[PDB]
Design a protein around this ligand. Sequence first.
Ligand SMILES: O=C1OC(c2ccc(O)cc2)(c2ccc(O)cc2)c2ccccc21
Ligand SMILES: O=C1OC(c2ccc(O)cc2)(c2ccc(O)cc2)c2ccccc21
Ligand SMILES: O=c1ccn([C@H]2C[C@H](O)[C@@H](COP(=O)(O)O)O2)c(=O)[nH]1
Ligand SMILES: O=c1ccn([C@H]2C[C@H](O)[C@@H](COP(=O)(O)O)O2)c(=O)[nH]1
Lengths: 286, 285
Amino acid sequence: RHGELQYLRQVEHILRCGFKKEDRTGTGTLSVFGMQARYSLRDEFPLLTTKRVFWKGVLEELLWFIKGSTNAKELSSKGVRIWDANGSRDFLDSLGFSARQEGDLGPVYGFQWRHFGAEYKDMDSDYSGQGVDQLQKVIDTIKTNPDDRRIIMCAWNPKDLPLMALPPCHALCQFYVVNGELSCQLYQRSGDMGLGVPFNIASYALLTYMIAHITGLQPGDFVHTLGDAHIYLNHIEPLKIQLQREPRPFPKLKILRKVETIDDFKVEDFQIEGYNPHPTIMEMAV
Amino acid sequence: HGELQYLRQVEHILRCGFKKEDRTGTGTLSVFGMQARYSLRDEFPLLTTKRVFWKGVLEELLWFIKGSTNAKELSSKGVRIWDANGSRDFLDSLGFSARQEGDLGPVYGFQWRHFGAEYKDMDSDYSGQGVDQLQKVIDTIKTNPDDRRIIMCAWNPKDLPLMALPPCHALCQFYVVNGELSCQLYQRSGDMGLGVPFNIASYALLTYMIAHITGLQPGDFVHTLGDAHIYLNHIEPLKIQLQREPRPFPKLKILRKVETIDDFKVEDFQIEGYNPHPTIMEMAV
Ligand SMILES: O=C1OC(c2ccc(O)cc2)(c2ccc(O)cc2)c2ccccc21
Ligand SMILES: O=C1OC(c2ccc(O)cc2)(c2ccc(O)cc2)c2ccccc21
Ligand SMILES: O=c1ccn([C@H]2C[C@H](O)[C@@H](COP(=O)(O)O)O2)c(=O)[nH]1
Ligand SMILES: O=c1ccn([C@H]2C[C@H](O)[C@@H](COP(=O)(O)O)O2)c(=O)[nH]1
C-alpha cells in the first residue's frame, strides 16, 4: 500500500467529517483536531505525487534552519521566497519591529534549534556558542545513547514567542532508534492540508535522512502528528479533483557524498530520483 | 467503549512492538508513534480494566496548577509519586547536593506558570515572573477560541539540566469547535502498563477544569505517544488485563461553580460510578 494514501485518507476524512471552523485568515476551514500518519523512509522518500511539492524550497529552507539563520533574505537569495512576506517592512512594522532591518524574522526555528534560550538581538548578531544547540544534542545522543526516550528538538519557545514574526507551526520533534533505523515524529500544531502539510512531510523526512546519514543509521519512519488539521474552504474543489488521482511510486533520495557533520550538507549533496508528480492544480491563505 | 482504544494499543505493542533496551535496564517492547482519542462528552476516561490511582491524579494536577516544585507539598496530601525524585540520594546523583530534600527543580508546575523565569529553589517567590502559560491558554480560549496556537509546553531545553527528570508529558494543545474544548497531549515516552492510564486521567481532568472555567463542554482528549512501551516484566500482568471486559466509564462531576483555575480544590470533584476490576505490576526505576 502506497504511503501517500494515508495523506489522501486524511484529506478525505476532513472533507467528510471535519467541522466548519473560522480561522485567523478569514478564509474559513473544515477542521479535525488530532490526526496521525506514518510515512516509511525505507528505500523511498515521501515526496507527494498527486500534487507537485516545491522540493527546492524544502531543501533550501532546511539548510537555512540548520545554519541558524533568522534572515529571510538569506533564504530568498537561494531562489526561495516563502519567508519574504513575513520579513517585509510593512509586516514587521505591523508587529512593532520598526527597528528591525527588512528580513529580520526574530528568533524563529533555526535560532531555537541552534541557540535555544540565548538572548535575541537581531538577525546579523553573532550567536556562536550561545544557548542550547538542540540539533547537535540530538545528533550526539543518537550516537551515544540511541535508546534514549528524550531525543527532542523544540522550536516552541513561550518566552521568545512575542519576538517572532510567526509562532512556530512545526513545534516539536522527537527521534527514536531501533533495529539500526532512525525515526522522527513531528508535532505540528496546525496543518494546511492542501498546501502546507506536503511540504512539512518532505521537510522532516529530509531532516531524518540527513541525521541518519550523519549517525550511520538507516532512515526508518516519519510519524506526522497534527493538532488542527484543516482544509481551507477554497481548496475543497481542487482537492476533490486531486483525490481521484492515483499516487505514483515515491521517488528516492540519494546523498551523493559522505558527510560528517550536519553543518557540512549543501544543496548539491542531494538528488531526488524518479519524481513524477501529477500535473499541477490552489490559492494560499495569508 | 473508549477503553478499547487503550487496550488495542497494548495489544498492538505486544504483537508488533520491537524489543528495545532502556534507561532502567528492564527492557521493553516498543512502538514509536501512536495516537488514541478519548471522548470526554458525558463520561470520564478513568480506565476500568485496572484501577487508576485517581487521588494521585487529582492532587498531582492541583499541585501542578499552583506552580509547586516541592515533592513534600504533594506528599503531605498522601500522594508519594514524586518523593523518590526529591530524595537526598537521587538529588546527590544528579549533582544537586546544595538543594534541599523535595526540591525537584523547575519541572511541570514551574514551566506551566513561570516559563523562562530564573529558577532559584522551591521556596522562592516567582509571582509575576516568566510566562504563565496556563492562564494564557484560558484567556485565549475565552477571547479567541479559533486560535490554532493554544499551547502549554513543559519541555524547556534551557532548564532541562536543572530538573529532577526531563518532562514526559511534554506539550499540550487546546482546540475549540461547536462549543467543545478538546486537548491533545504529546507524551514523549509512555509506560503503557502503569503510567499511561494515569496520564490519560490527568489530562482529561485538566480539560474538564478548563472547560468549566471557560463555559465550554469537554470534547476529546487526543493522546499522542512517542516511545510507547511495555516493560518486559509487565507482559504477563497486561495479558491478564486484556481479557477483562471494560465497564462503562464513570462520570466526573464538579460540585460548584469555580471562577479561576487556581480556585479548584479536591472537594470540588466527585467521580461517580467507577467500578474497576481489581488492581494487578512492578515499577521501573
Ligand atoms: O509560502 C509558503 O509557505 C508554505 C510552507 C510550508 C511549510 C514550510 O516549512 C515552509 C513553507 C505554506 C503553505 C501553506 C500554508 O497555509 C502556509 C505555509 C509553502 C508551501 C509550499 C509553497 C509555498 C509555501
Ligand atoms: O509513582 C508513579 O508515577 C507514575 C506517574 C505517571 C504519570 C504521572 O503524572 C504521575 C505519576 C508512573 C508510573 C509508571 C512509570 O513508568 C512512571 C511513572 C504513576 C502512575 C500510577 C501510580 C504511581 C505512579
Ligand atoms: O509549516 C507550516 C506553517 C504554516 N502552515 C499553515 C497552517 C495554517 O493554515 C497556517 C498557519 O496559521 P496559524 O495556525 O498560525 O493560525 O499555515 C503549515 O501547514 N505548515
Ligand atoms: O508521566 C509520565 C512519566 C513517566 N512515564 C514513564 C515512561 C517511561 O517508562 C518512564 C520515564 O523514563 P524515560 O522515558 O525518561 O527514560 O516513566 C510515564 O509513562 N508517564
